[PDB]
From a paper:
Protein methyltransferases are enzymes that add covalent methyl groups to arginine or lysine side chains of proteins employing S-adenosyl-L-methionine (SAM) as a cofactor. The NSD family members are large, multi-domain enzymes that, in addition to the catalytic SET (Su(var), E(z) and Trithorax) domain, include known epigenetic reader domains such as PHD and PWWP domains, and these reader domains likely contribute to chromatin binding.
Two peptides were synthesized based on the H4K44 substrate sequence used in the assay, PTD1 (15 residues) and PTD2 (5 residues), where K44 has been replaced with Nle. Significant reorganization of the autoinhibitory loop is required for peptide binding, as the peptide overlaps with the loop in both the WHSC1 and NSD1 structures, both of which are in autoinhibitory conformations. In the complexed structure, the autoinhibitory loop moves towards the C-terminus of the construct to open the binding site for the peptide. The interactions of the peptide with the protein are dominated by hydrogen bonds; with the exception of the N-terminal acetyl group and NH of the glycine residue, all backbone amide and carbonyl moieties are involved in hydrogen bonds. As previously noted, the norleucine residue points towards SAM and the terminal methyl of the unnatural amino acid is 4.1 Å from the SAM methyl group. The alkyl chain also makes hydrophobic interactions with Tyr 1262 and Phe 1259.
Author numbering:
A (entry chain D): 1 to 5
B (entry chain A): 1058 to 1266, 1269 to 1285
The structure:
Amino acid sequence: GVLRI
Amino acid sequence: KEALEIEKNSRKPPPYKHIKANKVIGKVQIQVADLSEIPRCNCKPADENPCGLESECLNRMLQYECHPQVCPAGDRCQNQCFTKRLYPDAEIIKTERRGWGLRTKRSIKKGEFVNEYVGELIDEEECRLRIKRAHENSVTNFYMLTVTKDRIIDAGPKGNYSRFMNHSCNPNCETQKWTVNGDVRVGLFALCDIPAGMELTFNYNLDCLGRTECHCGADNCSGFLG
Ligand SMILES: C[S@@+](CC[C@H](N)C(=O)[O-])C[C@H]1O[C@@H](n2cnc3c(N)ncnc32)[C@H](O)[C@@H]1O
Ligand SMILES: [Zn+2]
Ligand SMILES: [Zn+2]
Ligand SMILES: [Zn+2]
């Protein structure tokens, strides 16, 4: 998955 | 004959290119401001700690980095963190269940700039391809972070020490989106005072696009990563 701010 | 003895503790992390700044890939293009477009704050060069953490600084309040040719404070300006690349010295560590991690070698104060999250800058399509290829190769480490919907930083093949910071459900750092010379970049900032020697963590806020198990150890751990 992708990290988010 | 021991399964315990089968010592496959990698003595070093797998290779990556240690880089200073983001590297655009494919369609992703370079975003740069004209000097005429850089915002000017109202801090005074006579101030104690001009543009600092405690200041009223209009730029810092909106997560805009000052440009020294623009800021009324000159080179006294304390809001040049990304460009100066002054990071607290850090050290890669081996964990038991979270792979390689990162610890600080010095004490860090609440709100202080810890690092920049750097890597290859890729679009959504490339991000998805990379994730697919990773799943096909049973890769379990992911270093992708969304800046905006078609600008993703992949710190996997190339990055700095920030690529080693693990996820925590009760972290000591957080990511923030800042504008530096008209480009959007990602900083890591301390959420609290951090003593020298402490492992540096942040909340990944992961968009999974099933879940991975979390070993952060926090009282409020969800049990799942991100
Ligand atoms: C950006 S990397 C961090 C550095 C990584 N530990 C390494 O050894 O290169 C992120 C990966 O580390 C692992 N990881 C990070 N935080 C973790 C946690 N709290 N629990 C379990 N695994 C974690 C996951 O595999 C995740 O995809
Ligand atoms: Zn200012
Ligand atoms: Zn300034
Ligand atoms: Zn957790």
